[PDB]
Amino acid sequence: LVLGQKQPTWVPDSEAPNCMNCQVKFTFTKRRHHCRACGKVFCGVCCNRKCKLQYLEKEARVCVVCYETISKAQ
């Protein structure tokens, strides 16, 4: 994927026991969030900002990695 250019494969929650950035374990209250740019699964602290994604033509939640990568490209 060119980030933001096409919808990524979303990792199913059933296949995502830990934040794919910081490694924290998901729990009853530490819940899963997908990045709309890369499709990986994160805790809120690692995935809480939004940016405009071309394939959506609107703002969507992205992870720490994709945010910096895309917001610079914009």
Binding residues for Zn(2+): 19, 22, 35, 38, 43, 46, 63, 66
At its nearest, how many Å lie between Zn ion and the CB of residue 22? 3
Q: Name which of 43 and 51 has its Cβ closer to Zn ion.
A: 43
**Which element (helix H / strand E) includes 58?**
strand 58-62
Q: Residue 32 corresponds to which tokens in the numbers above?
A: 């899963």
| Binding positions for Zn ion, rule: CB under 5 A | 19, 21-22, 35, 37-38, 43, 46, 63, 66
| Residue closer to Zn ion (CB basis): 14 or 25 | 25
53-64 in b/e burial notation, b at 16+ Cβ within 10 A?
bebeeeebbbbb
